Amino acid sequence: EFYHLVDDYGRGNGFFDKFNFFTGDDPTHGYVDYVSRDVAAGAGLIGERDGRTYMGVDFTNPASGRGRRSVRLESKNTYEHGLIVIDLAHMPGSVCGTWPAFWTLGTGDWPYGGEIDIIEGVNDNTFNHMVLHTSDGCTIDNDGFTGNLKTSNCYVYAPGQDANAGCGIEATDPNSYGKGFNSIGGGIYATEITPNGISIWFFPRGSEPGDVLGDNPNPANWDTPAAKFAGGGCDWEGKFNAQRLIFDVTFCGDWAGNVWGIGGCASRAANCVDFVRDNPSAFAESYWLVNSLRVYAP
Ligand SMILES: OC[C@H]1O[C@@H](O[C@H]2[C@H](O)[C@@H](O)[C@H](O)O[C@@H]2CO)[C@H](O)[C@@H](O)[C@@H]1O
Numbered sequence: 001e002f003y004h005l006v007d008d009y010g011r012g013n014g015f016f017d018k019f020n021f022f023t024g025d026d027p028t029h030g031y032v033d034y035v036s037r038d039v040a041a042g043a044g045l046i047g048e049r050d051g052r053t054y055m056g057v058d059f060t061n062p063a064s065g066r067g068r069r070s071v072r073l074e075s076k077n078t079y080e081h082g083l084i085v086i087d088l089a090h091m092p093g094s095v096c097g098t099w100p101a102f103w104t105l106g107t108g109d110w111p112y113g114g115e116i117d118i119i120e121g122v123n124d125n126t127f128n129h130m131v132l133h134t135s136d137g138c139t140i141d142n143d144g145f146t147g148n149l150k151t152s153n154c155y156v157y158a159p160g161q162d163a164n165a166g167c168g169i170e171a172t173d174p175n176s177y178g179k180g181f182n183s184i185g186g187g188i189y190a191t192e193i194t195p196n197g198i199s200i201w202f203f204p205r206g207s208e209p210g211d212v213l214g215d216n217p218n219p220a221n222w223d224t225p226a227a228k229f230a231g232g233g234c235d236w237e238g239k240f241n242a243q244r245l246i247f248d249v250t251f252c253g254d255w256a257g258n259v260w261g262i263g264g265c266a267s268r269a270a271n272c273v274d275f276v277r278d279n280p281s282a283f284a285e286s287y288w289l290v291n292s293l294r295v296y297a298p
């Protein structure tokens with residue numbers, strides 16, 4: 001009894017019933033128009049596809065107003081310590097101008113409750129980024145994971161790191177994100193939060209352990225995590241509080257929009273906004289397809 005199930009999200013409407021739909025202007029300043037559940041359902045942005053829960057974006061109409069239509073779901077329930085396991089058949093692709101993310105956010109004013117980016121990236125990225133964003137006074141050790149450490153200071157305004165880079169670790173598997181991830185039918189991302197740290201495992205389709213989807217997973221016997229955040233350089237218990245789960249896909253903005261001109265999407269249009277507004281068909285691959293989402297507690 002290392003871990004026991006405390007919250008199974010099910011699928012379809014039962015799944016959406018466990019989330020609040022965020023409709024405010026995008027905090028990351030993207031060219032996105034977050035819509036309500038009713039509007040999303042009416043636009044085909046959410047639903048069920050052969051038993052899997054679907055969440056995508058508008059890939060039909062030229063954009064206007066705040067931006068291209070999408071959804072941002074934040075869980076009603078919160079968890080302080082536990083294991084979050086998501087099994088995906090598909091995630092938003094490596095589409096130019098997009099910025100998808102499956103993550104967790106603490107309670108209170110950001111970043112004081114902590115933030116965990118489990119699946120995140122922008123534009124035509126190949127590798128997934130796993131990152132923590134915290135208040136000042138939190139750095140991680142460089143060992144215990146298979147990914148490549150990019151930044152060690154989790155403080156959102158860490159000196160010497162781009163603003164809000166946080167402490168990030170990049171996966172080494174090309175199938176850990178977008179295009180590659182979808183070509184193999186997805187996989188599973190398991191995230192463990194304890195008073196001693198946070199760990200994130202990525203199991204590409206077919207390589208998951210026998211208990212990962214069961215009622216009593218035991219991360220202790222799993223292969224090395226893709227990312228591990230720990231060490232005496234952080235008060236792990238105090239830096240993170242009750243976390244809510246979030247699904248979203250924004251466009252351009254602080255990250256995707258800012259790096260548009262230096263990457264491979266630069267040739268698609270002079271600016272990210274122009275591309276996102278005038279090329280609806282380009283975003284057909286920008287959707288999540290969830291097999292299951294289950295949360296466990298020690
Ligand atoms: O990862 C390097 C990249 O970080 C960018 O900051 C992102 C951060 O990576 C992401 O985890 C967070 O959710 O959003 C911030 C931006 O607000 C940074 O903007 C890039 O310049 C940098 O290359």
Ligand SMILES: OC[C@H]1O[C@@H](O)[C@H](O)[C@@H](O)[C@@H]1O
Nearest residue numbers: 027028105109110111115164
């Ligand atoms: O949405 C969670 C937080 O994300 C951060 O990137 C933004 O800067 C905050 O304004 C926001 O509250």
